[PDB]
Amino acid sequence: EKRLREKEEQKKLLEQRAQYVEKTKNILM
Amino acid sequence: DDEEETYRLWKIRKTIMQLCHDRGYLVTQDELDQTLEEFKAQFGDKPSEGRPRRTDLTVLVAHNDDPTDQMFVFFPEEPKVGIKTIKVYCQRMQEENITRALIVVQQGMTPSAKQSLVDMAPKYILEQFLQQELLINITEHELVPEHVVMTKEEVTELLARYKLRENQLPRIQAGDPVARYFGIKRGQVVKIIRPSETAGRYITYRLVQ
């Protein structure tokens, strides 16, 4: 079960990193 | 004048990341625990030489509940901020559809700039911070108990349980350091949880006024 929550952290880590790149052009733009 | 400024910028960024996380926005554990060396790596090391520029430090985060709720944190280069730069930031917020923004000033903000900030309130909510205020996180001081923002449903439940009108709760000012830290406005209720030497724990509520 603790491993499962470990996976979710990466998912949220991905969920934020994924949109930082999209945002990054926005801060650039 | 350069190592000191780099340390200052790193501290401000760390406090702003903590603030954004506390307000519910999405921030990764690496940004929170970013070391000074990692700051010198990602960003410059010679603010005097323009690396990093304060314009390089802008951050944009999205809320955990809806990605449509987003917030800017701006670091104006000019120690005193006037209406013109506020209009610039409002323009880009309008262009990108971002409704919230934090502005970190160095010396302060002109009275008319503050009036502008309050004038466009309902449309765009943008708040002001001195960087001196952000050099530490006041919510981590031992004297500051845990503050939690209540939802409207929670406030309704509270007033129903104790059969109170809003004006009977204790108060907190909107200009309170912790209230500004959490970005709460008039009419919201903050739940405060503190240890007590008699009961062990004690929850009090303050209405923002």
Nearest one of B189, B206, B197, B111 to B155, comparing CA atoms: B189
Q: Cβ of A27 and B58 within 8 Å?
A: yes
Fold adopted by B137-209: Eukaryotic RPB6 RNA polymerase subunit (3.90.940)
Q: Are strands B171-172 and B200-208 parallel, antiparallel or unpaired?
A: parallel
Beta bridge partners of B108: B80
Nearest one of A9, A10, A12 to B64, comparing CA atoms: A12
Q: CATH 3.90.940.20 residue ranges in chain B?
A: 137-209
Q: Cβ of A19 and B62 within 8 Å?
A: yes
Contacts of B160 (CB under 8 A, 6+ apart): none
Report, at the CATH architecture level, how domain B1-136 is classified. Answer: 3-Layer(aba) Sandwich (3.40)
Which experimental approach was used here? cryo-EM
| Rounded-to-integer distance, Cα B28 and Cα B147, Å | 22
Q: Which residues of A touch B67 (CB under 8 A)?
A: 19
One-letter amino acid of B38: E
Q: CATH 3.40.1340.10 residue ranges in chain B?
A: 1-136
Q: Tell me the C-alpha to C-alpha distance, in Å, between residue B37 and each of B3, B6, B19.
A: 11, 10, 21
The resolution, in angstroms to one decimal, equals: 2.0
Residue B124 near residue B101, CB atoms below 8 Å: yes
Q: Cβ of A19 and B67 within 8 Å?
A: yes
| Rounded-to-integer distance, Cα A29 and Cα A27, Å | 5
Q: Which residues of B touch A23 (CB under 8 A)?
A: 60, 62
